[model samples]
Structures are given as structure tokens and as C-alpha cells.
Target: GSSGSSGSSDASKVTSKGAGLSKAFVGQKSSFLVDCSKAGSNMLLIGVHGPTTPCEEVSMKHVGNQQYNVTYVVKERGDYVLAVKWGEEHIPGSPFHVTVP
Candidate 1:
């Protein structure tokens, strides 16, 4: 109750993006899942933020469960940031920092 910041905070938020991965390798196919079966259906966006247009390929599929299967590969070897957006909104721990060697 300090400073009167009584924000109820947001709820019903999706959890686990790439198992909270913060590092990636060059040319490596990175895979992760977005769990949304608990409460909804939203689109996922994977964007690469780097100097050399990283992230060569990207793919996603929904099978049986409501989980979003996301995968990508990095071509350029360097540092990069991966931004994951759910429903046009960035997740809590998005913009994951990744270094490709």
C-alpha cells in the first residue's frame, strides 16, 4: 500500500515462452512452445532485432493441444534479440537476448 500504487496487476496472461530461453546459436533451429490452452487463442509473432537480418526461417504449428509450436533458425552469426508478441502485445520477458557464435 505504499505510494498508493494499488494496481491489481494483469491476470490471465499466458506463460512460458521458449522456456524462457535467453541465448541462441547460429544456424541452430531453436524450438519453443507457447501454451494458450488454459484460456485463449492468439497469434504469435517472432521478430529478429539485430544488425545483420538474423532469423533465416520461422515456422509454427498447432497440434492436438492448444500449444503454439514455434521454431526458427539463425543464419548470421552475431548478437541478436528475439521479440515474441502474443496478440500484438509483447510478453513479459520478451526481446530475449541471444548471441550467435
Candidate 2:
């Protein structure tokens, strides 16, 4: 809700370039996931099927303030979705999906 002067708020949206991730093959050195966690803002990652099932647990390494060098591994070749939400809200413009070859 906003004041009488305002009547709307910016809602998030899910966007992906065609799919989600680039085509990846097995035994490839690629980052399967990305962590958006920072001091100013926290991050939440959900797998293909939402948060119910997570693809894999990842750790966010501190690179700098509000920045990190998070790393993840791709054990297999398959399609996957990664949703980055704000705290607990499943905001739009945050959900992303990817396909692996």
C-alpha cells in the first residue's frame, strides 16, 4: 500500500534469455549456480521445483562488501531453474531457469 498520492508499487518479474542457463555438458568446469547474498541484501535460491527441492547446497565466499565469489558445480547435464527471491517473498524478475546439454 502507498499513500494517496501513489497508487502502485513496482512488482518483480521473472525473466530468462530463452531458457535459463547456457548449454553445459558433463565434466565441464562451469558455475551451476550464483549466490546473490550480500550485506545490504540477502539472497534465497530455489531449484527447478521451487524451494521444496534444492539442486545442491552452495556456499557464498566473501569477495568484497556486497560482493561474493560464490561457486557451484554441475554434477550432471540437465535443465534446471534457479529462483532468487528477496528474503521470503517469491518476487518476480528473480526466477531464472537454465538448460544443460
Candidate 3:
């Protein structure tokens, strides 16, 4: 088959990010896993936005490719917001609420 550049073509690159938990208990070993395969970038940045200066960055444990786990201890009983970002855009459901009991 002989052909040149098609007059029209379809191109797509699907991207996404997800979390596993929305709530956790205080004074306990609580954690949440985030998937950033579809984030369309590398070195994903995840953190918490609550009772802190400049927010607290989560230390991601590289479970696998594009898979990460964050284990954080909530010292105080309050509401915390979890967020993730890659490249220059915030992932879906950015600033998710996390309630500690």
C-alpha cells in the first residue's frame, strides 16, 4: 500500500489520577494509595493541605510503575485536604477532603 499523510487523522492521549481512600482515623497507621499512570508526566507530587506552612508533601512509596503509597499520621483531629499534581496541572478531584476520627 502506497499512501501519504492522511488528510485527517485522530490522535488522543488519555490521562488520569486516582486515590483509594477519603477518610482516616487519627493516632493510627493510616495510608492511601494514588495511581498516576495517566497523569501524562513523571515525578508526581502529592501532598496535604491542612494545618501547616506551605502544606505537607507526602512521601510517596514507589510500589510499582505509576503506583504510589502515602502513609501519614494525623497528630490532631481535624479535616485535611489531600491533593496531587503532575506537570503543571492538578489531577482530577484535586484537594480531596480527608476526615480523621
Candidate 4:
């Protein structure tokens, strides 16, 4: 499971974000990746959660310097909360929404 939230800084200097997902589909294999090099963090946590659904298992791998790959399966057909944290700071898009059909 992923943990933490992102920190807030100057609204203009907000390009150094972390973690991203392409798209999510129901009963299909999907995954996302996180790049924390610019975010100034190392440790990363990511997971998915929804009502009446078991927490999605997240697998983390170090692909490169300050970069990590997060892979998980989407179960159920509802709103899933996707979150990620880098060290003490949460990624920019933590607790984002995922819809499955």
C-alpha cells in the first residue's frame, strides 16, 4: 500500500511533480510509474483503495536514479482512490480517482 501526501510550494514552480498513470481499465492489466528525481525524494509508496474492495497490491521497482515503476491490478467496478507518496511528501496527484467498468 502507498502512503503520504505531496507538499505544497509556489504555484508557479510546480513542474517537478511525481508519479503518473496512463489509463485504468476494468479486468485488464494496467500500471503506472513514478519519477521522484526532480521531486527531491527517494522512498515511494503507491496503492489503490475503494469501498467494499480489497486494497490493490502494489509492486515497486527501481528503474533508474530516483525513478520507480509501480504496477497494480484493478479489481471491482467503482471509484478507486490512487495515491502515492515520495518520502515525506505525497506525489502531486495523490488520492486521484480511477473509474472501472
Tens digits of lDDT, candidate 2, 1-101: 45465323222422223223444344454443333432124453443453333344445455544343434445655665555444455545444445567
How big is the positional error of residue 30 in model 4, measured in Å on the Cα after superposition? 1.3
Q: Residue-pair clashes per candidate, as listed?
A: 0, 7, 1, 3
Candidate 4 stretches greater than 4 Å from native: 1-23
Q: Which stretches of candidate 1 lie over 4 Å from their true place?
A: 1-12, 17-20
- CA shift at 16, candidate 1, in angstroms? 2.5
Q: Write model 4 residue lDDT over 16-55, tens digit each, in one string.
A: 2322353466657665655555565345665455555764
Which is the leading candidate under lDDT? 1
Candidate number that wins on TM-score, 1 or 4: 1
Candidate 3 lDDT over residue span 1-87, tens digit each: 497554321112223332224676666656666565554444655556655433223456779776677666666666777666654
Looking at model 1, residue 4 earns an lDDT score of: 55
Q: Global lDDT of each model?
A: 0.64, 0.43, 0.55, 0.56
Name the top TM-score candidate.
1
Q: Measured by TM-score, how close is model 2 to the native structure?
A: 0.46
Off by over 4 Å in 3: 1-20, 52-57
**Superposed Cα deviation of residue 11, candidate 4 (Å):** 13
RMSD of each: 7.8, 7.2, 7.4, 7.2
